[PDB]
Structure 1
Amino acid sequence: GAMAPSYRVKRMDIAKNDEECVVNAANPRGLPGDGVCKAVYKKWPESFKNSATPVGTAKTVMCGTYPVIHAVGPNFSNYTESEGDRELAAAYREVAKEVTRLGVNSVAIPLLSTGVYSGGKDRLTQSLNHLFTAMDSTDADVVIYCRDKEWEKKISEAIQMRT
């Protein structure tokens, strides 16, 4: 575990993370995809061997000795708000189990279902709160990766509020 487990946020490509493992915002079929998933495919293509897994689950595949945790958030274009919320919560709980099993001291994580799976809604708070519910009981350093400057400020504020 980390000496003083923390949350941090960085605005940069998650493929250039400084953590001991990465969470991919994966699709259920283990395809290269777009956004975070395509950056992860470019950086760790070996991690997409038998990475297909259902919505609401996480499957880890090693790239050398570096773990890639494929986490499948719901596409809110297809799920009801109620069922999508349940699957999004579940995906993060499976990420917490994998992070724990791997024995890493740190993990790089994107906000699941906030891009092309968002169904055109802002889900920063929804996705971040499910991330916290899952990861609060873990002792890994968590570093959240985002693209947008306004999201960086809102994520930083949400972390500092609980402190």
Structure 2
Amino acid sequence: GAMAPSYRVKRMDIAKNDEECVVNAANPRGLPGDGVCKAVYKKWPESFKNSATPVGTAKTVMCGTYPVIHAVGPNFSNYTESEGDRELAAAYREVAKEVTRLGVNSVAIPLLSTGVYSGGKDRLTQSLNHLFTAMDSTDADVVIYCRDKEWEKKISEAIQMRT
């Protein structure tokens, strides 16, 4: 584990991360997909062998020795707010178990269900709070990746508020 476990946020492509493993915002069928998923497919295509897994779960596949944790958040266009919220919290809990099992000192993570699976809604606070709920008990350095300038500022404010 990290000597002083921390949270940080960076606004850039998660495929260029400087962490010991990456979390993919995966689809249930292990397809190349869009957004973060398509960038992860271009960088670590080997990690998509048998990566299909149900909504609310995480499945790790190695690309060489580099772990790619495929986490499947719900698509809020299909789920109700109540059941989608429950599946989103569950996907993050499974990411925390995988990060712990791997023994890594750092992990690059995107905000699950905030892109095309958001159902056209702003889910920054909802997704980030479920990320914190799951990762707070781990000792890995967590680096959150985003692409929007205003989202970078809001995630940074939320991290600093708790310190």
Shorter-normalised TM range: over 0.9
Deviations 1:91-135 (A, max 9, x none): 000000000000000000000000000000000000000000000
Q: What is the match of residue 35 of structure 2? A: 35
- C-alpha separation between the residues in 2 aligned to 1:32 and 1:92? 21
- 2:5 is paired with a residue whose SS is coil
- C-alpha separation between the residues in 2 aligned to 1:47 and 1:22? 11
- C-alpha separation between the residues in 2 aligned to 1:45 and 1:111? 21
- C-alpha separation between the residues in 2 aligned to 1:70 and 1:159? 24
- C-alpha separation between the residues in 1 aligned to 2:91 and 2:34? 19
| TM value normalised by structure 2 | 1.00
Deviations 1:119-161 (A, max 9, x none): 0000000000000000000000000000000000000000000
Deviations 1:13-60 (A, max 9, x none): 000000000000000000000000000000000000000000000000
Whether 1:10 aligns to 2:10 is: yes
- 2:116 is paired with a residue whose SS is coil
- 1:20 is paired with a residue whose SS is coil
Report percent identity of matched pairs. 100
Task: Please list every run of 5 or more consecutive structure 1 residues that lacks an aligned counterpart in the other structure.
Answer: none
- 1:138 is paired with a residue whose SS is coil
| TM value normalised by structure 1 | 1.00
The 5 A counterparts of 1:37-116 are: 37-116=37-116
Root-mean-square deviation (CA, aligned residues, Å) is 0.1
Deviations 1:42-87 (A, max 9, x none): 0000000000000000000000000000000000000000000000
How far residue 89 of structure 1 moved from its aligned partner, in angstroms, is 0.1
Q: What is the match of residue 147 of structure 2? A: 147
